[PDB]
Amino acid sequence: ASALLGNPSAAALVDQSAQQGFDRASEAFEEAGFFSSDGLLYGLF
């Protein structure tokens, strides 16, 4: 929680960081959905 973070359970920080990453992936998938064709590039992203 605070030994090296400097910000005052561990099954939490990993989930938050992964949530940020997966949110970016979800936004990429949404952009892929917008461009029906020429959109699978965003799917690969």
Place this chain on the structure above:
Amino acid sequence: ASALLGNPTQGASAAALVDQSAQQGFDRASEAFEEAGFFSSDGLLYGLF
């Protein structure tokens, strides 16, 4: 900075060089993505590149 580069550099750091080379590579990738954008279909080949 200059031990083996030979070409004189006025003054800078080290990771700097990793950033410059990675920038060249990523710029080529970005140009490939731009080409993929140009060809709407038949353009995902450039995306794979």
Place this chain on the structure above:
Amino acid sequence: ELQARIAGEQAAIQNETTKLQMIAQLRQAEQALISEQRRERNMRILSSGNQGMPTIQ
């Protein structure tokens, strides 16, 4: 009178031509609407506003 009758008949065929044009436009609009519904479904599945995921239990 027969000439004017045939002229009216031509007018009727003109009307059918206009109706066929209108039917073709409606066909195109219907295909566009079906595509729009497809894309709405696709957007709903992939929306970034979704918050759910499977739970480990």
Place this chain on the structure above:
Amino acid sequence: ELQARIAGEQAAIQNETTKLQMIAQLRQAEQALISEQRRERNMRILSSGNQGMPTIQ
């Protein structure tokens, strides 16, 4: 006079036919313009002239 009236009526239906053709062309042009706007947005997102990236802090 009735024959000339029916002839004018045919001319009116002809005009409607031309108008429908013009509407169809405009429909096609509008779809093309929407596609152009989509591709402009796509080009703007993927442009190689962009210089930004996330910062580590």
